[PDB]
Design a protein around this ligand. Structure first.
Ligand SMILES: *[C@@H]1O[C@H](CO)[C@@H](O)[C@H](O)[C@H]1NC(C)=O
Ligand SMILES: *[C@@H]1O[C@H](CO)[C@@H](O)[C@H](O)[C@H]1NC(C)=O
Ligand SMILES: *[C@@H]1O[C@H](CO)[C@@H](O)[C@H](O)[C@H]1NC(C)=O
Ligand SMILES: *[C@@H]1O[C@H](CO)[C@@H](O)[C@H](O)[C@H]1NC(C)=O
Ligand SMILES: *[C@@H]1O[C@H](CO)[C@@H](O)[C@H](O)[C@H]1NC(C)=O
Ligand SMILES: *[C@@H]1O[C@H](CO)[C@@H](O)[C@H](O)[C@H]1NC(C)=O
Lengths: 305, 305
């Protein structure tokens, strides 16, 4: 006989237990539960028995609890789990042995200091990972830690203590968001192999330089946000890059702008047209840029000086 | 041309924009969006244009923002909205003119001080309402404020400042949860007409007495939680009530227990059997209760002394 905990609402394969101050995961829940919402409670840990007989559960929300420890494989019995939301908790590290069906993991606002490559081995259905707002440091991220996710399309590590782009990122990535960290430079090695990367967010960091060859490793990149950093000049490779269309560089320390910083010498029919370029809040003024600098842009609205 | 905001993920009619520090609701979202997640951002208000062309949106999550004002009818254009989650914000009152399709509203942990009967007029699809953790006072709740919801099945006002059960509750109610408030007494008037009420949670309040005739107004009540209150004796009407099965009275100030406090004189075949009764953490001891007191209970496990 399955029971709905007192105060929780159990309707249509949805078990709603938010805002109840629960101190641990309820048991004896309906075997067919598809979505379990345990948000805003006082759960301190996930024990090995906590999720038994929840074989149809595709979504688990544990956002805003006080979780400081999760037994290895505690989520394993959730053979159909696609979304796991552990944001706003007190995790010290990511949970080991998670369902191989997992498509999205969010562990925003925790106390992560180490990202073991082992937690991600085999998770081949994973497409989105959000690990922002953690005291994590670049040293805490094992190299190739995310390599195991052959389908990963999006990853975001924001407002943490990392200082360099993680090495060994899965080549399936289309979006890499590292806004609001403490990155100081962009090395070509970290972006090596990201042939599918379309968006690269590096805004609000402390970047002072972008090695030549960097953007060339992301040949199909369409959006580059580097605003609010410490750049002394526009990153190189924009003129010979063929797919870049959006380049945000406002709020930096760019001294001057070369004639071929964005457009190549002769018109290149193969280079995609720029749809947006931002340069305001920089030392350079509109009067220090030769009108020829944006000769490959055919919309005045695009360039914002 | 619909756009997915930078850093948000837009996949399968789901727009995911949690944890991005956004300062306002994004516009130009895909017209077919069914679920919009704006949790954990910095949105301060909902303007009248914020939700245009989101006609298929059945779920809106704005949990954990800094919302302090919502224009009247701002949610009106969401003609198919079934769930609205506004918990963890800074609302001073509930929003006027909400979609008539609304099935669930959660405004837990806000700064609600007044519940106008007008916000709920016409919301005939509403089945669940959670208004816990607000500085709300009994005076701030207009009488019959919830009357307008002819399908309301569950309502919860917990950890607030109310001191009396709200008057004029919809008779469709099956669950009334008022745990953790400052209620001092249970008057029969407030429970008048609740012929469908199955569960009544009044735990963790300051109740010192239950008027006779109270439980008789909830003739089909199956669960009564009155633990952690200031009761001087078991509430009356339990013996002649026919459906009550669970009566939690632990952590009170009950002096003694009468012979017919739970069971009527002669065995009543029409009275449902008790499946759970709690009396521990009270002045009375197991040796002050005549064994005849629970003569209509046929499971020793039921009574917890
Ligand atoms: C970075 O780590 C230090 C300790 O090493 C900590 O004090 C600081 O809060 C962290 N920064 C962030 C924003 O996580
Ligand atoms: C980057 O390449 C450009 C070639 O256009 C060159 O002028 C510049 O000095 C290079 N950066 C350095 C210092 O390696
Ligand atoms: C900008 O660069 C100049 C040298 O090129 C340096 O002196 C100055 O401190 C920089 N401004 C910033 C970002 O503080
Ligand atoms: C009750 O209201 C008072 C002000 O009238 C406030 O100080 C107090 O925090 C409120 N109690 C709760 C738990 O909301
Ligand atoms: C409640 O009803 C009982 C009848 O069993 C009676 O003994 C009691 O005095 C009544 N409470 C009061 C004081 O109204
Ligand atoms: C319990 O009731 C007695 C009188 O019946 C009273 O003196 C005492 O203060 C009460 N205990 C509590 C709940 O403080």
């Amino acid at each position: 006989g399955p029971v709905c905990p007192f105060r929780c609402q159990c309707h249509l394969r949805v078990v709603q237990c938010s805002d109840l101050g629960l101190e641990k995961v309820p048991k004896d829940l309906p075997p067919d539960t598809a979505l379990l919402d345990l948000q805003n409670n006082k759960i301190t840990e996930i024990k090995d028995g906590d999720f038994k007989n929840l074989k149809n559960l595709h979504t688990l929300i544990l956002i805003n609890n006080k979780i400081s420890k999760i037994s290895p494989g505690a989520f394993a019995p959730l053979v159909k789990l696609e979304r796991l939301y552990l944001s706003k908790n007190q995790l010290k590290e990511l949970p080991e042995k998670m369902p191989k069906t997992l498509q999205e993991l969010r562990v925003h606002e925790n106390e992560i200091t180490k990202v073991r490559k082992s937690v991600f081995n085999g998770l081949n259905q994973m497409i989105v990972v959000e690990l922002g707002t953690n005291p994590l440091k670049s040293s805490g991220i094992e190299n190739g830690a995310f390599q195991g996710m052959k389908k990963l399309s999006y990853i975001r590590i924001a407002d943490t203590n990392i200082t360099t782009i993680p090495q060994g990122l899965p080549p399936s990535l289309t979006e890499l968001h590292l806004d609001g960290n403490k990155i100081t430079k962009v090395d070509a090695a970290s972006l090596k192999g990201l042939n599918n990367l379309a968006k690269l967010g590096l805004s609000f960091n402390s970047i002072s330089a972008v090695d030549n060859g960097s953007l060339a490793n992301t040949p199909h990149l369409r959006e580059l946000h580097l605003n609010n950093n410490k750049l002394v000049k526009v990153p190189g490779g924009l003129a010979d890059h063929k797919y870049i269309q959006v380049v945000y560089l406002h709020n930096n320390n760019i001294s001057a702008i070369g004639s071929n910083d964005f457009c190549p010498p002769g018109y290149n029919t193969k280079k995609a047209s720029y749809s947006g370029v931002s340069l305001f809040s920089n030392p350079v003024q509109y009067w220090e840029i030769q009108p020829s600098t944006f000769r490959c842009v055919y919309v005045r609205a695009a360039v914002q000086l």
